Amino acid sequence: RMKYRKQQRGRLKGATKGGDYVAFGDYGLVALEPAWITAQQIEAARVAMVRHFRRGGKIFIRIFPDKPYTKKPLEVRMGKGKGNVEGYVAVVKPGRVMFEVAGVTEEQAMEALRIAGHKLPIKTKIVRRDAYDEAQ
Amino acid sequence: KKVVAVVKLQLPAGKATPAPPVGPALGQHGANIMEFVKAFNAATANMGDAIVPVEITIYADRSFTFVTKTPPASYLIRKAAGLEKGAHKPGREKVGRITWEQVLEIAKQKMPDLNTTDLEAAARMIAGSARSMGVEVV
Amino acid sequence: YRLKAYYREGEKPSALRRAGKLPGVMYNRHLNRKVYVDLVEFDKVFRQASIHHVIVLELPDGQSLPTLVRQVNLDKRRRRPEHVDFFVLSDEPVEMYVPLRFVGTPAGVRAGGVLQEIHRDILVKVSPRNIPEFIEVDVSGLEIGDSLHASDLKLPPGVELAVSPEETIAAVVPPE
Amino acid sequence: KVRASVKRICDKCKVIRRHGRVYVICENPKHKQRQ
RNA sequence: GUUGGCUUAGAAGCAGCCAUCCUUUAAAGAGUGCGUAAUAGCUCACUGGUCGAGUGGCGCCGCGCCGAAAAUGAUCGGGGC
RNA sequence: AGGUUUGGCACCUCGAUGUCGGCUCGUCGCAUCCUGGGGCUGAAGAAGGUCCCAAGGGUUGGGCUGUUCGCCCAUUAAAGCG
């Protein structure tokens, strides 16, 4: 909700930023293919997330739209598009961890995310943890 | 069509014919409302205000009634305890709480229709089912 | 724990990676060497050992060095280690993260609400001779309310917390 | 008697895979499907 | 003792939101399951006799399969593999 | 997915590719409107609902509008879409 905007499409090269690590939560949802995820999609996932286990734990959505997706009105050529119209999106490079759950069973957690994946226009993978950290 | 079966019931001792539990239940399930009911009277006559349980059938001993047996755990629990219905919510409410001794004792007392028999056993049963209700140990 | 650490000569990191090895490096104010292990090896150890407990490497020539993993790198696409720097311990007081354990069950069940491991394990200055396995968290008397952090831990001897102190190390929050 | 994303209604609903069609079904004609 | 909870008109798994103790051994259902008015019945989710052996659970890799409906006669360029 | 609508692009045709609708003559597609089969059903029967095979052959006459389309009249196994 700010700054001067209606920006350049730009492209998604290798996913040099497609691969973080569960930061909070317990289990997670990492992306396999690069893409633009419409807020419309995030919610549509998150919602079903919470909704899968009514009155459950916590949901963390690390990805976040901010890129304005413009579009023409159904005509020809003459200056950038009315822009936005539908809205904004976030850019996901294969490997980024989109959503992550916690405070619940793996049977409940794992199965929860699985659904989300159906909402997102990508191919996903689910992860656990115990991996990366900065301890000794 | 008629499938025989001893009827296991919990009812208002002192009374005899609780509309829902003895009208339908007994009569149609495999017994009889008001008759089993007056037998009830025969017994419940001196057990009736902390609720009373009896399984009644037309069985061996060649007769009708069967076995009267200690008013179920958790329930007699609150019963002696000091509350009406259920404490609405158990555990996540931790508001109904009783104590060690008076507990194990009341156990000893109700001990009749009690599996096996053991001081610690009955006491523990108390703490546990009591919890089941909201009758938690404290 | 322990596991062979074969000396890295210095040729084709991928060659390893791909072959079966796992490039690494061991160092301290004194030592600094190129090493390599084996996925299945390192994994089987770290997966459970991580970098909370001591790791001793068996160099092809007698050597038996006390170490810890300061940092491991990942190949974004499909998390798989790429490199590892090993901290060859000795005696000087050293820094390191030590695990924490949240036992019991703080109020948060009637209506729900779950905690949030705000700092699974923390770093505290300590001398190697003493290295606690994991530390305890006596939290269970706080609901959706506040949270604990900094000096709210029975940090044993030689455990001068090495943080702020102020780092919120835990917190309980509402459900969905 | 179906076409996608099935988990096997009931266990009775055993996956009957013949000819080429992957039609899983139980004893129940309600728990019956055909890919 | 389980048939503990609002709702019980009925939860007393086989209504739904709060439990997850106990008794006690064949063992351990804090009951995954066909139901109605609950309940009342059915199978192992536990265990002996023979039987005496590889069996259940997840996961990456190679190839392939379903997903796959169009208009003048069809075919991988053809034959045929 | 398809190329039936509305559009985008401006590649052949401006020393010319007559452009709605009707009529006549049709032929092909299946994503089937009838008529052949079949599985489910919250299918007792008679009806239906839905999905699956399957075009061999069918797929009416009028009122109103230039109409295609539609809305009506009267029927029909049906009055299919391209």
SS3 A117: helix
**What token pair was written down for C15?**
């060659």
Query: Order of strands across the sheet with A97-102?
Result: A58-61, A97-102, A28-31, A124-127
Longest dimension (CA), chain D: 23
Encoded tokens for D32: 């019956």
Chain A CA closest to residue C84: A132
What's the rounded Cα separation, in Å, for the pair A31 and A63? 11
Reduce the DSSP state of residue A65 to 3 states and report it.
coil
Residue with minimal CA–C1' distance to E19 is: B132
DSSP state letters, A5-21: ---------S-TTS---
Whole-number Å distance between alpha carbons of A102 and A21: 14
B84: number of Cβ within 10 Å:
6
CA C91 to chain centre: 19
Q: Is the peptide bond before C165 cis (omega within 30 degrees of 0)?
A: yes
Quickly tell me which residue has 């061996």 as its tokens. B60
Cβ-contact B70, B61 below 8 angstroms? no
Whole-angstrom CA distances from D23 to A47, B87, D28 are 33, 51, 13
Task: Please indicate the experimental technique that yielded this structure.
Answer: cryo-EM
DSSP per-residue codes, B17-74: --HHHHTHHHHHHTS-HHHHHHHHHHHHTT--SS-EEEEEEEETTTEEEEEE---THH
Smallest CA–C1' separation from D3, nucleotide: E67
Does chain A reach chain C with at least 3 CB pairs under 8 Å?
A: yes
- C158 HSE (CA, 13 A, CB side): 13
CB of B124 lies under 7 Å from some atom of strand E:
yes
Contact yes or no for B89 and C109 at CB 8 A? no
Q: How far apart are CA B103 and CA B119, in angstroms?
A: 11
Q: Is the Cβ atom of B90 within 7 Å of strand E at any atom?
A: yes
Contact between chains at A58 and C114 (C-beta distance less than 8 A): yes
Q: Which of A60, A126, A136 to mutate to test the interface with C (most CBs of C within 10 A)?
A: A136
Cα B38 to Cα A92: distance, rounded to the nearest angstrom? 77
Please check whether residue A91 is in contact with residue A12, taking contact to mean a CB–CB distance below 8 angstroms: yes
Q: How many CB pairs under 8 A join B and C?
A: 7
Q: For residue B88, give every residue at least 6 positions away whose Cβ sits within 8 Å of its Cβ, in sequence order, or none.
A: B134
After what residue numbers is chain B broken, C–N > 2.5 angstroms?
A: none
Strand F contacted by D20 CB (< 7 A): no
Report chain C residues whose CB lies below 8 A from the CB of B93.
Answer: 110
Distance D1 CA to F45 C1' (A): 25
* C-alpha R_g of chain C: 20
Which residue is it, tokens 């311990």? C89
Name, in order, each residue with C-beta under 8 angstroms of D31's C-beta and a sequence gap of 6 or more: D9, D10, D12, D13, D25
For residues C69 and C51, the answer to whether their CB atoms sit within 8 Å is: yes
Could you check: is the Cβ of residue A76 within 7 Å of any atom of nucleic acid strand F? yes
Which residue bears the tokens 């047996």? B69
Rounded CA-CA distance A19/C14 in Å is: 20
Residues of A in contact with C79 (CB under 8 A): 19, 21, 127, 131-132
Q: Chain E positions under 7 Å from a protein CB?
A: 1-10, 12, 18-25, 37-41, 65-67
Q: Which chain B residues touch C109 with a CB distance below 8 Å?
A: 91-92
